[PDB]
Amino acid sequence: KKVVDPFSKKDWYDVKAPAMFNIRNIGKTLVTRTQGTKIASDGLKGRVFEVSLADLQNDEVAFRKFKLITEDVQGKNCLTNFHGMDLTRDKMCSMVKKWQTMIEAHVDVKTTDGYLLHLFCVGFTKKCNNQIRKTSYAQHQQVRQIRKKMMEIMTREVQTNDLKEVVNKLIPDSIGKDIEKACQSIYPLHDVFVRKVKMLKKPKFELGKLMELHG
Amino acid sequence: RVQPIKLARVTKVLGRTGSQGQCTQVRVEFMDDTSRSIIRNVKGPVREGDVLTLLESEREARRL
Amino acid sequence: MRAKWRKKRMRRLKRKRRKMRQRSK
Amino acid sequence: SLGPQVAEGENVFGVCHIFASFNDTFVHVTDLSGKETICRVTGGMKVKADRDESSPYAAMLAAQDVAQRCKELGITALHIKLRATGGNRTKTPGPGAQSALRALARSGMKIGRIEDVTPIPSDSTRRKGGRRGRRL
Amino acid sequence: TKKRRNNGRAKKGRGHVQPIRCTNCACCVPKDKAIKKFVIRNIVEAAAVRDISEVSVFDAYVLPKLYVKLHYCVSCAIHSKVVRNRSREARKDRTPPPR
Amino acid sequence: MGRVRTKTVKKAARVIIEKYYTRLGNDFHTNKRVCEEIAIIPSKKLRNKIAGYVTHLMKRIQRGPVRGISIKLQEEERERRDNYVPEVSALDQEIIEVDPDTKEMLKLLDFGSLSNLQVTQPTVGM
RNA sequence: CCCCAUGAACGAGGAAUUCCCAGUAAGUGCGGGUCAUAAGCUUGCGUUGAUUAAGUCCCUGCCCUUUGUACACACCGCCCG
RNA sequence: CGCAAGACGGACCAGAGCGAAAGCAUUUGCCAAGAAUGUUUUCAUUAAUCAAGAACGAAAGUCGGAGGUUCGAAGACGAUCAGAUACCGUCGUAGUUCCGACCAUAAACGAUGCCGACUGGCGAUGCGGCGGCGUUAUUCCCAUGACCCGCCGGGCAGCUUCCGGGAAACCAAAGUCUUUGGGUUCCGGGGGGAGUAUGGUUGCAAAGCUGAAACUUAAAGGAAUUGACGGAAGGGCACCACC
RNA sequence: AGCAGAGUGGCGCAGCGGAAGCGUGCUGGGCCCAUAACCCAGAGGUCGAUGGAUCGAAACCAUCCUCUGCUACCA
């Protein structure tokens, strides 16, 4: 559009996060003022909001970015809902290096509620305690165990435990740390992260369940 | 541009560049900030400790 | 490339002789 | 131009979407969401020569204007997202990546964060140029 | 006769490999003949680092790095001068020169 | 500029310092006149050079020993370092003990005194 | 060689190109050489006396190493339909 | 921001592994196959190499269907050039992909037949087995994995030298050769003419396999050395070079 | 004859309201050891007649003639 003063016809807003975050003031957006051919809220819902982890928790690392969608608008405050987490590029790149064997697996999983998720994890072999060898490569048999046991843990903790409790385990990354010790006997391993989660399906709006998060 | 006329002075000369040695790399101190320093290309014969008259410090040198 | 071309010009020429002899009978 | 009703001790954070490589530089300042946006300036608009569109000063002169209209509105800080072309191409920044930052920061705008974003395949379709590739 | 012993960079015990494309000749060569150069740089580059770091909204922040894996071919390596001609008794090194 | 000294200067400069070490001063003019009397240098400009290098050498010879030519007093102090050093007169400190696997050799060769035992851990770099 | 008369092109020069770093360039006169008569030439000498540089391998060329070659009448080479 | 289509398996991925060769990288399961090692098990010479004959055999191409994102012979344009049917830019058909039939060729190169014996040194790496003074992981454990050290097989490779050989380059094999003989298959005879002529055979097509002579000529070719030259690389230098 | 073009200043084509316009050729110079390619330099001058505006007219615009191009008839 090319309407005269098209940033003095826009209306400022605020964007509020769930109660689980210490700092809930995400930031600000703007949409155009209401017309009868297209209203404010219809051009404001269905967005994505990339936000860092450090930005909200204010205690910890600047990676593990979360996506948040505006599902509801309430009087100049846009309330958000979980949509899936992702990871930075540089961290994901730096860990990958020569003379290691990268280990990967995924699962499709359902929550106790109607949410459906598709988690992606990663493991890397350890450059061991006092090698004089310049390799850290592992057998193929050993790897397929580690992948099997990385699925077993990540289904147990996410099939039970409702949507919010999932998030609570991933913020300190209790999930990943649990796998690191449980695989330690068959190869020591340093590093476990969940590089993506993609919320595939989700249930109905459910206003009662909605406001619990922003309580 | 719309920046006023700046003045900055040499701290050290680095070496000559260009394709006939006609340009000279030089390090210069901003003469208002003593921890700020930019590298420049300067045409004329320079010694050290003399002052220039920069029209901008947006520009910066990297090669011949 | 040179040898591969000398083998190619003589291939098409050989093919033409076949056609020309098949034409003659 | 009307900004929000407080920005006194806080900042308002936009996303800068700097584009990189050759024959072109974009700077395109947007919302946090990126759904809606503000002014968008190219190095082909500052400089017309069809060959200085990727130059340092053309990228600097661009951001030297864009950063004014930011603060005019009320956007004071910037998260940064990069983009090199990628997609089985050069996948490496142009000249005008380093350039625009140095200019826009010292114009007065705040910098909040910076990151690399590039579209990198996990192996995808064949690249233009043929088996023997470009020569001359 | 031969000016090599490997006749490539390595093809020992293997009948075929998947090829890979040059970044700036747009050429096609084997993976195990291509010049493999990995690269590390800072994003912002070190000339303007002071002018940027002061203008951060945070009081500290370590900057990302730029990770790229480049594969060059025989011709586009020599021309950009990451390699050069070497002497007859000085081609027998496998060793990278130190920084 | 230029004017790097040739070998004809450096050959005779060394010789003239070896056999007339005593006559030398460290002044230019005195070292000139000595070279004029103990030898003949057939040019005048050549003489002014050989003196100046003889001077420049004599500065360094009053420090540590030069490796191009010899003098007597350096060969004195050479001999003084090379006939006794003050560090030891004892061999080596008279009693030194060793750890096992050396003791086992000595057991089978009729020796059984002046030993210690320590059985240090496995292994190389570990 | 001298005297009087006659009074042209030419009003700062295209494509290109030469030479020069300190009593140097440029301006200016003089001696010697050839010489029966005769320097716009050449070789030396004084007098007046700047601007610009304190560098580089871009062009032209030269020295050293390494490398490639079907060249050695030596790339102004050799050789194909 | 969402959806669809087709293609494709990055970084990790290495003088690493497997396969007769051609070749072979996302997950999980199923189906059959194989090497090495271990064994105080079984059979008792059942073997080695190979005319005839047989299976597999890149890419391109041909025939019939499906599909057709991407790249792209052909073709149409835009430039560069005296010319420019080219290198470069835009568009784009066949093809590229899958299914069923054909085609049998490549620098299908380690340009190096297969099987067996003997003859230096040294450090690694992948797999199996054996031993251990050492640490660590879990139930404190044992059984075991990870790391450390050593030993025994067979495998991809490297380094080292007056083993010996070679025209040399080089090679623990290309060695054990005028002091010539372990077994066996294939193949070569100066350079052109020519993989042409011709007849046979196979193929739908394209072609594949088999393959001469007349005539012509004193050189063709290999390795290495010294020069010169290079729109090769690294240094240095000149107002007869430049700024 | 209806329509169109022209009536050289070396050639050929004839460009527009500022006295050769374009393309080409010839001749000479430059570059290069040399040739090609490439770069420069030329040449007596109402441009068929009769008129008007005009500072001026092949060229700004008319009145006439002739030659040709296309169409085509009086004869």
Short mmCIF file of C-alpha atoms (C1' of nucleotides) in Angstrom, two decimals, chain H:
data_model
loop_
_atom_site.label_atom_id
_atom_site.label_comp_id
_atom_site.label_asym_id
_atom_site.label_seq_id
_atom_site.Cartn_x
_atom_site.Cartn_y
_atom_site.Cartn_z
"C1'" C H 1 2.82 -17.61 6.79
"C1'" G H 2 0.76 -22.16 4.69
"C1'" C H 3 0.38 -25.80 0.67
"C1'" A H 4 1.86 -28.81 -3.68
"C1'" A H 5 5.43 -31.23 -7.23
"C1'" G H 6 9.72 -33.40 -8.53
"C1'" A H 7 14.76 -34.00 -7.57
"C1'" C H 8 18.48 -35.10 -3.84
"C1'" G H 9 21.08 -37.39 0.82
"C1'" G H 10 25.32 -31.90 2.92
"C1'" A H 11 28.87 -30.68 6.91
"C1'" C H 12 30.02 -35.34 9.62
"C1'" C H 13 33.12 -38.49 5.16
"C1'" A H 14 39.14 -40.25 6.17
"C1'" G H 15 46.41 -42.41 1.29
"C1'" A H 16 38.99 -45.44 6.18
"C1'" G H 17 35.50 -50.05 4.90
"C1'" C H 18 32.84 -53.71 1.72
"C1'" G H 19 32.31 -55.91 -3.55
"C1'" A H 20 34.80 -60.38 -8.97
"C1'" A H 21 34.65 -55.91 -11.63
"C1'" A H 22 31.21 -52.13 -12.92
"C1'" G H 23 30.28 -49.89 -8.09
"C1'" C H 24 28.18 -48.81 -2.89
"C1'" A H 25 26.58 -43.16 2.38
"C1'" U H 26 19.14 -40.15 5.86
"C1'" U H 27 15.56 -44.09 9.49
"C1'" U H 28 13.70 -48.84 10.76
"C1'" G H 29 12.29 -53.85 9.56
"C1'" C H 30 12.36 -58.14 6.54
"C1'" C H 31 14.82 -61.51 2.71
"C1'" A H 32 18.83 -64.38 1.06
"C1'" A H 33 24.74 -63.91 0.66
"C1'" G H 34 30.15 -63.32 2.04
"C1'" A H 35 35.34 -62.36 4.11
"C1'" A H 36 38.62 -62.64 8.22
"C1'" U H 37 39.54 -64.94 12.93
"C1'" G H 38 38.81 -69.01 16.68
"C1'" U H 39 38.65 -74.73 17.01
"C1'" U H 40 43.07 -81.25 20.00
"C1'" U H 41 35.53 -81.26 14.76
"C1'" U H 42 34.63 -83.68 9.61
"C1'" C H 43 36.36 -85.53 4.47
"C1'" A H 44 41.17 -87.56 2.63
"C1'" U H 45 44.08 -85.24 -2.66
"C1'" U H 46 38.70 -83.81 -3.77
"C1'" A H 47 44.08 -79.04 -6.81
"C1'" A H 48 46.34 -74.89 -10.14
"C1'" U H 49 45.63 -72.27 -14.93
"C1'" C H 50 42.37 -72.30 -18.82
"C1'" A H 51 40.23 -73.09 -26.32
"C1'" A H 52 34.69 -74.25 -26.36
"C1'" G H 53 30.69 -72.14 -23.72
"C1'" A H 54 28.32 -68.86 -19.64
"C1'" A H 55 26.87 -64.57 -15.85
"C1'" C H 56 27.61 -59.48 -14.51
"C1'" G H 57 29.32 -55.05 -17.09
"C1'" A H 58 29.79 -46.89 -16.15
"C1'" A H 59 27.99 -42.95 -19.23
"C1'" A H 60 25.72 -42.05 -23.92
"C1'" G H 61 22.23 -44.29 -27.48
"C1'" U H 62 17.53 -47.33 -29.32
"C1'" C H 63 12.11 -49.41 -28.52
"C1'" G H 64 7.38 -49.36 -25.47
"C1'" G H 65 4.81 -47.01 -20.90
"C1'" A H 66 4.87 -43.50 -16.47
"C1'" G H 67 6.98 -38.81 -14.94
"C1'" G H 68 9.31 -34.14 -16.18
"C1'" U H 69 11.44 -30.00 -10.28
"C1'" U H 70 16.54 -29.22 -11.76
"C1'" C H 71 20.31 -29.02 -15.14
"C1'" G H 72 20.45 -29.18 -20.43
"C1'" A H 73 23.04 -31.50 -26.51
"C1'" A H 74 19.72 -29.22 -30.54
"C1'" G H 75 17.53 -24.60 -31.50
"C1'" A H 76 16.14 -18.96 -30.92
"C1'" C H 77 18.31 -14.59 -28.91
"C1'" G H 78 22.12 -10.80 -26.32
"C1'" A H 79 27.26 -9.61 -26.32
"C1'" U H 80 32.81 -10.07 -27.42
"C1'" C H 81 35.57 -10.30 -32.23
"C1'" A H 82 37.97 -7.66 -38.70
"C1'" G H 83 35.28 -12.45 -38.83
"C1'" A H 84 32.94 -15.71 -33.96
"C1'" U H 85 28.30 -21.23 -36.38
"C1'" A H 86 32.76 -20.64 -30.07
"C1'" C H 87 34.50 -19.38 -24.73
"C1'" C H 88 30.44 -15.58 -21.64
"C1'" G H 89 24.73 -13.95 -20.45
"C1'" U H 90 18.99 -15.09 -21.23
"C1'" C H 91 15.36 -18.59 -23.05
"C1'" G H 92 14.82 -23.82 -24.31
"C1'" U H 93 13.54 -29.44 -27.06
"C1'" A H 94 15.55 -34.33 -26.79
"C1'" G H 95 17.85 -36.22 -22.55
"C1'" U H 96 18.36 -36.07 -17.22
"C1'" U H 97 14.10 -39.64 -13.30
"C1'" C H 98 11.17 -44.53 -12.73
"C1'" C H 99 9.20 -49.46 -14.93
"C1'" G H 100 9.94 -53.47 -18.87
"C1'" A H 101 13.10 -54.87 -23.29
"C1'" C H 102 17.77 -53.94 -26.16
"C1'" C H 103 23.11 -52.04 -26.82
"C1'" A H 104 28.69 -54.65 -24.70
"C1'" U H 105 31.88 -50.18 -25.30
"C1'" A H 106 35.79 -46.26 -21.70
"C1'" A H 107 42.59 -43.33 -19.80
"C1'" A H 108 36.57 -50.08 -18.01
"C1'" C H 109 44.58 -47.41 -15.62
"C1'" G H 110 48.03 -49.61 -10.36
"C1'" A H 111 48.52 -47.91 -18.24
"C1'" U H 112 51.62 -53.43 -13.92
"C1'" G H 113 47.70 -61.73 -15.51
"C1'" C H 114 46.54 -65.68 -12.02
"C1'" C H 115 48.59 -69.54 -8.26
"C1'" G H 116 53.18 -70.94 -5.13
"C1'" A H 117 58.24 -70.50 -2.56
"C1'" C H 118 62.41 -67.52 -0.65
"C1'" U H 119 64.85 -62.68 0.68
"C1'" G H 120 65.89 -56.01 5.28
"C1'" G H 121 64.41 -52.42 8.95
"C1'" C H 122 60.44 -48.99 11.37
"C1'" G H 123 56.04 -46.59 12.83
"C1'" A H 124 50.61 -46.56 12.00
"C1'" U H 125 45.39 -47.81 10.63
"C1'" G H 126 40.64 -51.22 9.94
"C1'" C H 127 38.82 -56.53 11.74
"C1'" G H 128 39.22 -61.08 14.81
"C1'" G H 129 41.77 -63.72 18.78
"C1'" C H 130 45.21 -63.87 23.16
"C1'" G H 131 47.71 -61.73 27.57
"C1'" G H 132 48.29 -57.47 31.46
"C1'" C H 133 51.18 -54.02 35.59
"C1'" G H 134 47.08 -49.46 34.73
"C1'" U H 135 42.42 -45.90 35.20
"C1'" U H 136 37.25 -44.97 34.15
"C1'" A H 137 31.66 -46.06 33.12
"C1'" U H 138 27.05 -49.51 36.05
"C1'" U H 139 24.26 -52.89 40.96
"C1'" C H 140 30.17 -52.12 45.05
"C1'" C H 141 30.75 -55.54 41.76
"C1'" C H 142 32.21 -60.09 38.67
"C1'" A H 143 30.58 -61.19 33.02
"C1'" U H 144 31.38 -56.09 29.84
"C1'" G H 145 32.16 -51.30 27.27
"C1'" A H 146 35.69 -46.84 26.87
"C1'" C H 147 41.02 -45.41 27.15
"C1'" C H 148 46.39 -47.46 28.02
"C1'" C H 149 50.51 -51.38 26.84
"C1'" G H 150 52.23 -55.81 24.41
"C1'" C H 151 51.65 -60.33 21.32
"C1'" C H 152 49.54 -63.57 16.96
"C1'" G H 153 46.80 -63.86 11.98
"C1'" G H 154 45.19 -62.05 7.37
"C1'" G H 155 43.77 -56.62 4.74
"C1'" C H 156 44.15 -51.13 2.55
"C1'" A H 157 48.67 -48.20 2.70
"C1'" G H 158 53.20 -45.27 4.19
"C1'" C H 159 58.32 -44.14 5.68
"C1'" U H 160 63.55 -45.71 5.48
"C1'" U H 161 68.60 -48.09 2.49
"C1'" C H 162 75.13 -49.73 -1.49
"C1'" C H 163 68.81 -56.27 -0.44
"C1'" G H 164 68.89 -56.79 -5.65
"C1'" G H 165 67.21 -55.16 -10.31
"C1'" G H 166 66.48 -51.27 -14.30
"C1'" A H 167 68.18 -47.31 -20.13
"C1'" A H 168 66.61 -44.19 -16.46
"C1'" A H 169 62.43 -42.53 -14.09
"C1'" C H 170 61.75 -45.81 -10.23
"C1'" C H 171 60.33 -50.78 -7.80
"C1'" A H 172 60.77 -55.38 -0.96
"C1'" A H 173 59.11 -56.11 -6.12
"C1'" A H 174 59.12 -54.43 -11.90
"C1'" G H 175 63.93 -58.64 -6.66
"C1'" U H 176 66.05 -64.11 -6.42
"C1'" C H 177 68.23 -63.70 -14.98
"C1'" U H 178 74.32 -65.01 -19.95
"C1'" U H 179 75.60 -68.38 -12.63
"C1'" U H 180 69.48 -67.91 -18.04
"C1'" G H 181 64.40 -73.90 -16.70
"C1'" G H 182 58.51 -73.72 -10.05
"C1'" G H 183 53.21 -74.27 -12.84
"C1'" U H 184 50.03 -71.96 -16.78
"C1'" U H 185 46.97 -68.64 -19.89
"C1'" C H 186 46.87 -64.27 -23.08
"C1'" C H 187 49.84 -61.19 -26.28
"C1'" G H 188 54.22 -58.24 -29.25
"C1'" G H 189 58.02 -57.78 -34.16
"C1'" G H 190 60.59 -50.12 -37.60
"C1'" G H 191 56.98 -45.75 -38.81
"C1'" G H 192 52.56 -45.06 -42.07
"C1'" G H 193 48.61 -47.29 -45.26
"C1'" A H 194 44.21 -48.96 -41.30
"C1'" G H 195 40.75 -50.68 -37.37
"C1'" U H 196 40.49 -48.97 -43.58
"C1'" A H 197 39.36 -52.78 -47.69
"C1'" U H 198 36.72 -57.64 -48.01
"C1'" G H 199 33.75 -61.81 -46.64
"C1'" G H 200 31.62 -63.98 -42.01
"C1'" U H 201 28.66 -63.07 -37.54
"C1'" U H 202 25.52 -60.36 -33.86
"C1'" G H 203 22.02 -55.99 -33.46
"C1'" C H 204 15.15 -52.98 -34.61
"C1'" A H 205 18.53 -48.81 -35.08
"C1'" A H 206 23.44 -46.80 -33.79
"C1'" A H 207 27.24 -50.17 -34.37
"C1'" G H 208 30.18 -54.30 -32.01
"C1'" C H 209 33.48 -58.63 -32.79
"C1'" U H 210 36.59 -61.04 -36.28
"C1'" G H 211 40.49 -58.21 -39.98
"C1'" A H 212 44.38 -57.62 -45.06
"C1'" A H 213 47.26 -55.89 -49.26
"C1'" A H 214 49.12 -52.72 -53.01
"C1'" C H 215 52.03 -48.54 -52.29
"C1'" U H 216 55.22 -45.20 -49.29
"C1'" U H 217 59.33 -43.77 -45.91
"C1'" A H 218 64.71 -43.39 -42.35
"C1'" A H 219 62.94 -42.30 -39.02
"C1'" A H 220 58.81 -42.60 -35.50
"C1'" G H 221 59.13 -43.36 -30.01
"C1'" G H 222 61.06 -43.71 -24.40
"C1'" A H 223 63.95 -41.79 -20.13
"C1'" A H 224 67.30 -38.26 -18.58
"C1'" U H 225 70.78 -33.58 -19.02
"C1'" U H 226 72.20 -28.67 -20.63
"C1'" G H 227 70.21 -24.08 -22.90
"C1'" A H 228 66.44 -20.86 -24.80
"C1'" C H 229 61.18 -19.63 -24.38
"C1'" G H 230 56.42 -19.19 -21.25
"C1'" G H 231 49.58 -14.11 -21.76
"C1'" A H 232 53.96 -20.00 -15.04
"C1'" A H 233 55.45 -19.12 -9.55
"C1'" G H 234 58.85 -16.56 -5.82
"C1'" G H 235 62.78 -12.86 -4.96
"C1'" G H 236 65.83 -8.32 -6.77
"C1'" C H 237 67.10 -4.19 -10.08
"C1'" A H 238 67.07 0.53 -14.09
"C1'" C H 239 64.49 8.11 -15.38
"C1'" C H 240 68.06 4.46 -22.43
"C1'" A H 241 61.26 1.67 -17.74
"C1'" C H 242 57.04 3.84 -15.25
"C1'" C H 243 54.86 7.01 -11.36
#
